[PDB]
Amino acid sequence: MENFQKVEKIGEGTYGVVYKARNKLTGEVVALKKIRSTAIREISLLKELNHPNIVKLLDVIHTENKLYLVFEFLHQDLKKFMDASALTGIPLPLIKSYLFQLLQGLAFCHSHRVLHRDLKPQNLLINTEGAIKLADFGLARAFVTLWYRAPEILLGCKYYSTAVDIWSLGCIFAEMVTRRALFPGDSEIDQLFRIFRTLGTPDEVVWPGVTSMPDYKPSFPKWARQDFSKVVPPLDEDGRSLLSQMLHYDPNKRISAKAALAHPFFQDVTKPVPHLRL
Ligand SMILES: NS(=O)(=O)c1cccc2c(O)cccc12
């Protein structure tokens, strides 16, 4: 760890503690993640997966049989920006710019067959320039909150797809708009049933094969779907339309990131600058 001076703790990651640190040789300030052969080779692929909307993996230090991941440092995450913007809410043009950029990031990773698997506001990092970036991408395959988990994961599907990231991002889109988490479950069954209460209990009509999933139960209660107009007011019809497609039950029907980028919601997309106090 010789060339890094720890400045402060900035996160208790899923995979260990994250520090702000300075590279004693480059002068660069970085986020240093202390992780705690296949994982080695996986991580190595991620070092090549470079995109403006993906937090850059600067370096991977395997030493003393230990693993440190050196990332690009950003000063703020979406959860904290949302908490700070709660009285007024994030302006819609910024919501739309953030959603657009995240879909670009996703489209990139997905075309390389890399999934995130654990998108959440805490791992979406923002800068003063109006950029937003996906952090911790691909780490889950290389090696707490249920709120953003796709229903096929909850129902015990082991071979899930890139569609899981689209589901998570839909949940985040909803939360930016309403300033409340869409599905704040506190256990797997509470999470599932929150989803069902809003989108309707799924069946063979809307999701062929659902009743054959590993944790599906014929005893699940049967709730009717709510209208989105009740779910994410005052989002306009383009936004609600896009959100509905990101939240399709069947992962095969769920919109892809590339198709989402062509959606009419993005016709008037721009790139505003947020007001960040650092
Ligand atoms: N996702 S996180 O909470 O570990 C985190 C927090 C602040 C900055 C980070 C960063 O620059 C790169 C990755 C994760 C960060």
Characterize the structure shown.
It is classed as transferase. The entry lists the keywords transferase, mitosis, cell cycle, serine/threonine protein kinase. It forms a monomeric assembly. Identification of N-(4-piperidinyl)-4-(2,6-dichlorobenzoylamino)-1H-pyrazole-3-carboxamide (AT7519), a Novel Cyclin Dependent Kinase Inhibitor Using Fragment-Based X-Ray Crystallography and Structure Based Drug Design. With 278 residues, this protein is α+β, with helices and mostly antiparallel strands. It has two domains: 1-75, Phosphorylase Kinase, domain 1; 76-276, Transferase(Phosphotransferase) domain 1 (Transferase(Phosphotransferase), domain 1, Orthogonal Bundle), CATH 1.10.510. Helices cover 33% and strands 17% of the residues. The chain has ten helices and eight strands. It has helices at 38-46, 78-84, 92-111, 139-142, 151-154, 163-178, 188-199, 228-231, 237-246, 257-261; strands spanning 4-13, 16-23, 29-34, 57-63, 66-72, 76-77, 124-126, 132-134. The strands form two sheets. A five-stranded antiparallel β-sheet has the order 1-2-3-5-4, covered by helices on one side. A three-stranded antiparallel β-sheet has the order 6-7-8. Strand 2 (16-23) and strand 3 form a beta hairpin. Helix 3 packs antiparallel against helix 6. The longest helix is centred in the middle third of the chain and has 20 residues, at 92-111. The chain is globular. The structure holds 5-hydroxynaphthalene-1-sulfonamide. 5-hydroxynaphthalene-1-sulfonamide (LZ2) binds at residues 10-11, 13, 18, 31, 55, 71-74, 77, 122-123, 125, 135-136. 5-hydroxynaphthalene-1-sulfonamide binds next to strand 1 and strand 5.
